[PDB]
Design a protein around this motif. Structure first.
Motif, PDB file in Angstrom:
ATOM      1  N   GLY A   1     -15.828  13.212 -12.945  1.00  0.00           N
ATOM      2  CA  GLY A   1     -14.400  12.895 -14.682  1.00  0.00           C
ATOM      3  C   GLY A   1     -13.832  11.814 -14.020  1.00  0.00           C
ATOM      4  O   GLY A   1     -12.973  11.750 -15.162  1.00  0.00           O
ATOM      5  N   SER A   2     -13.025  11.247 -13.084  1.00  0.00           N
ATOM      6  CA  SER A   2     -12.245  10.140 -12.811  1.00  0.00           C
ATOM      7  C   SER A   2     -12.397  10.024 -11.750  1.00  0.00           C
ATOM      8  O   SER A   2     -13.442  10.412 -10.969  1.00  0.00           O
ATOM      9  CB  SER A   2     -10.975  10.932 -13.253  1.00  0.00           C
ATOM     10  OG  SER A   2     -10.069  10.070 -12.584  1.00  0.00           O
ATOM     11  N   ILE A   3     -11.734   8.776 -11.208  1.00  0.00           N
ATOM     12  CA  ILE A   3     -11.141   8.074 -10.085  1.00  0.00           C
ATOM     13  C   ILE A   3      -9.839   8.159  -9.221  1.00  0.00           C
ATOM     14  O   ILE A   3      -9.165   8.596  -8.537  1.00  0.00           O
ATOM     15  CB  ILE A   3     -12.315   6.807  -9.783  1.00  0.00           C
ATOM     16  CG1 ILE A   3     -13.758   6.702  -9.598  1.00  0.00           C
ATOM     17  CG2 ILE A   3     -11.441   6.421  -8.197  1.00  0.00           C
ATOM     18  CD1 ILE A   3     -13.877   6.038  -9.335  1.00  0.00           C
ATOM     19  N   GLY A   4      -9.215   7.764 -10.018  1.00  0.00           N
ATOM     20  CA  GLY A   4      -7.309   7.223  -9.573  1.00  0.00           C
ATOM     21  C   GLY A   4      -6.651   9.214  -9.756  1.00  0.00           C
ATOM     22  O   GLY A   4      -5.604   8.664  -9.313  1.00  0.00           O
ATOM     23  N   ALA A   5      -7.370   9.700 -10.533  1.00  0.00           N
ATOM     24  CA  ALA A   5      -7.317  10.845 -10.930  1.00  0.00           C
ATOM     25  C   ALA A   5      -7.482  11.752  -9.515  1.00  0.00           C
ATOM     26  O   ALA A   5      -6.782  13.398  -9.140  1.00  0.00           O
ATOM     27  CB  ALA A   5      -8.058  12.196 -11.681  1.00  0.00           C
ATOM     28  N   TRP A   6      -7.871  11.337  -8.422  1.00  0.00           N
ATOM     29  CA  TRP A   6      -7.548  11.527  -7.246  1.00  0.00           C
ATOM     30  C   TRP A   6      -7.267  10.721  -6.108  1.00  0.00           C
ATOM     31  O   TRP A   6      -7.737  11.397  -4.879  1.00  0.00           O
ATOM     32  CB  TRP A   6      -8.916  12.576  -6.894  1.00  0.00           C
ATOM     33  CG  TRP A   6      -9.837  13.396  -7.436  1.00  0.00           C
ATOM     34  CD1 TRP A   6     -10.199  12.986  -8.024  1.00  0.00           C
ATOM     35  CD2 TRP A   6      -9.521  14.568  -7.828  1.00  0.00           C
ATOM     36  NE1 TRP A   6     -11.052  13.831  -9.277  1.00  0.00           N
ATOM     37  CE2 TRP A   6      -9.940  15.146  -8.750  1.00  0.00           C
ATOM     38  CE3 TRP A   6      -9.131  15.743  -7.355  1.00  0.00           C
ATOM     39  CZ2 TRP A   6     -10.317  16.435  -8.870  1.00  0.00           C
ATOM     40  CZ3 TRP A   6      -8.648  17.164  -6.605  1.00  0.00           C
ATOM     41  CH2 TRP A   6      -9.529  17.740  -7.893  1.00  0.00           C
ATOM     42  N   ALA A   7      -6.769  10.054  -6.347  1.00  0.00           N
ATOM     43  CA  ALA A   7      -6.088   8.944  -5.521  1.00  0.00           C
ATOM     44  C   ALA A   7      -5.100   9.903  -4.542  1.00  0.00           C
ATOM     45  O   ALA A   7      -4.258  10.394  -5.286  1.00  0.00           O
ATOM     46  CB  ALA A   7      -5.232   7.810  -6.477  1.00  0.00           C
ATOM     47  N   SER A   8      -4.791   8.945  -3.157  1.00  0.00           N
ATOM     48  CA  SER A   8      -3.389   9.296  -2.215  1.00  0.00           C
ATOM     49  C   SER A   8      -2.281   8.634  -2.766  1.00  0.00           C
ATOM     50  O   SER A   8      -1.663   8.681  -1.865  1.00  0.00           O
ATOM     51  CB  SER A   8      -3.914   8.857  -0.800  1.00  0.00           C
ATOM     52  OG  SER A   8      -3.004   9.145  -0.064  1.00  0.00           O
ATOM     53  N   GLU A   9      -2.900   7.549  -4.009  1.00  0.00           N
ATOM     54  CA  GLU A   9      -1.762   6.842  -4.071  1.00  0.00           C
ATOM     55  C   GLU A   9       0.366   7.428  -3.840  1.00  0.00           C
ATOM     56  O   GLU A   9       0.521   7.260  -3.081  1.00  0.00           O
ATOM     57  CB  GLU A   9      -1.979   6.609  -5.771  1.00  0.00           C
ATOM     58  CG  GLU A   9      -1.032   5.170  -5.825  1.00  0.00           C
ATOM     59  CD  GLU A   9       0.137   4.583  -5.733  1.00  0.00           C
ATOM     60  OE1 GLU A   9       0.062   5.151  -6.650  1.00  0.00           O
ATOM     61  OE2 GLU A   9       0.358   3.394  -5.561  1.00  0.00           O
ATOM     62  N   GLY A  10       0.142   8.503  -5.073  1.00  0.00           N
ATOM     63  CA  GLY A  10       0.897   9.925  -5.274  1.00  0.00           C
ATOM     64  C   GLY A  10       2.095   9.679  -3.638  1.00  0.00           C
ATOM     65  O   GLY A  10       3.325   9.901  -3.740  1.00  0.00           O
ATOM     66  N   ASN A  11       1.435  10.391  -2.607  1.00  0.00           N
ATOM     67  CA  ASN A  11       1.034  10.773  -1.758  1.00  0.00           C
ATOM     68  C   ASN A  11       2.115   9.202  -0.253  1.00  0.00           C
ATOM     69  O   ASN A  11       3.539   9.606  -0.026  1.00  0.00           O
ATOM     70  CB  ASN A  11       0.504  11.601   0.121  1.00  0.00           C
ATOM     71  CG  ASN A  11       0.988  12.381   0.146  1.00  0.00           C
ATOM     72  OD1 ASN A  11       1.097  13.264   0.219  1.00  0.00           O
ATOM     73  ND2 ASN A  11       0.317  12.217   2.177  1.00  0.00           N
ATOM     74  N   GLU A  12       1.397   8.341  -0.461  1.00  0.00           N
ATOM     75  CA  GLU A  12       2.011   7.203   0.079  1.00  0.00           C
ATOM     76  C   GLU A  12       3.386   6.764  -0.550  1.00  0.00           C
ATOM     77  O   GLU A  12       4.420   6.518  -0.413  1.00  0.00           O
ATOM     78  CB  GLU A  12       1.393   6.105   0.033  1.00  0.00           C
ATOM     79  CG  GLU A  12       1.362   4.812   1.044  1.00  0.00           C
ATOM     80  CD  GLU A  12       0.406   5.700   2.368  1.00  0.00           C
ATOM     81  OE1 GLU A  12       0.541   6.809   2.108  1.00  0.00           O
ATOM     82  OE2 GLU A  12       0.800   4.795   2.853  1.00  0.00           O
ATOM     83  N   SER A  13       3.655   7.747  -2.248  1.00  0.00           N
ATOM     84  CA  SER A  13       5.450   7.592  -2.536  1.00  0.00           C
ATOM     85  C   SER A  13       5.957   7.996  -2.021  1.00  0.00           C
ATOM     86  O   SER A  13       6.914   7.751  -1.515  1.00  0.00           O
ATOM     87  CB  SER A  13       5.050   7.204  -4.191  1.00  0.00           C
ATOM     88  OG  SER A  13       6.684   7.510  -4.831  1.00  0.00           O
ATOM     89  N   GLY A  14       5.443   9.450  -1.696  1.00  0.00           N
ATOM     90  CA  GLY A  14       6.053  10.073  -1.765  1.00  0.00           C
ATOM     91  C   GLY A  14       6.675  10.639   0.061  1.00  0.00           C
ATOM     92  O   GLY A  14       8.077  10.952   0.349  1.00  0.00           O
ATOM     93  N   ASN A  15       6.499   9.307   1.030  1.00  0.00           N
ATOM     94  CA  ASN A  15       7.369   8.859   2.089  1.00  0.00           C
ATOM     95  C   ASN A  15       8.728   8.529   1.982  1.00  0.00           C
ATOM     96  O   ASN A  15       9.554   8.910   2.490  1.00  0.00           O
ATOM     97  CB  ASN A  15       6.218   8.025   3.157  1.00  0.00           C
ATOM     98  CG  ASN A  15       4.968   8.761   4.237  1.00  0.00           C
ATOM     99  OD1 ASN A  15       4.698   9.603   4.049  1.00  0.00           O
ATOM    100  ND2 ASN A  15       3.829   7.820   4.597  1.00  0.00           N
ATOM    101  N   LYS A  16       9.017   7.719   1.244  1.00  0.00           N
ATOM    102  CA  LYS A  16       9.854   7.373   0.397  1.00  0.00           C
ATOM    103  C   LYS A  16      10.886   8.114   0.220  1.00  0.00           C
ATOM    104  O   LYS A  16      11.916   8.720   1.308  1.00  0.00           O
ATOM    105  CB  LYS A  16       9.885   6.488  -0.768  1.00  0.00           C
ATOM    106  CG  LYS A  16      10.814   6.431  -1.761  1.00  0.00           C
ATOM    107  CD  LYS A  16      10.862   5.667  -2.605  1.00  0.00           C
ATOM    108  CE  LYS A  16      12.053   5.565  -3.515  1.00  0.00           C
ATOM    109  NZ  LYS A  16      12.335   4.489  -4.153  1.00  0.00           N
TER     110      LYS A  16
END
Ligand code: CA
Length: 74
Positions: A19-34
């Motif tokens: 039902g989506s694609i971006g709604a399962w990106a690992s994107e956020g995690n690379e942010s959290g490394n900050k």
DNA sequence: GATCTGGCCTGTCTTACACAGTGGTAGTACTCCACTGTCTGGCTGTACAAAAACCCTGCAG
């Protein structure tokens, strides 16, 4: 190229599977490394036995719906 | 080719320079629970007197 096969080959199939694609990106995690970085700089105990324990404790605290809910910021 | 000597090298001894800051742990000196009965001193309906600083007035110059 690989990306091209992916984007032509399963996009409709995947957005059917979920039902989506971006709604399962690992994107956020690379942010959290900050986040990790910052914690390591400031809230360290300078002991590799504990440093991670402390970092994890503070991190978990940071990522609770509760305390964020107390962060009104209307 | 023997000799000499200033300048260079090694080793020496002396004065500096980062190591704070952060979290967990503990002893310990400083402070409110409930239970109390009592007293002082602000509050309040007006009437009574006492000070204060001006504004007019009046006498005096
Ligand atoms: Ca120094």
């Amino acid at each position: 190229t690989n990306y091209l096969h992916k984007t032509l080959a399963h996009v409709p199939e995947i957005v059917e599977r979920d039902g989506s694609i971006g709604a399962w990106a690992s994107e956020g995690n690379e942010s959290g490394n900050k986040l990790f970085r910052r914690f390591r700089k400031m809230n360290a105990r300078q002991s590799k036995t504990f440093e991670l324990e402390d970092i994890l404790k503070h991190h978990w605290l940071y990522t609770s719906k509760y305390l964020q809910k107390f962060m009104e910021a209307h």
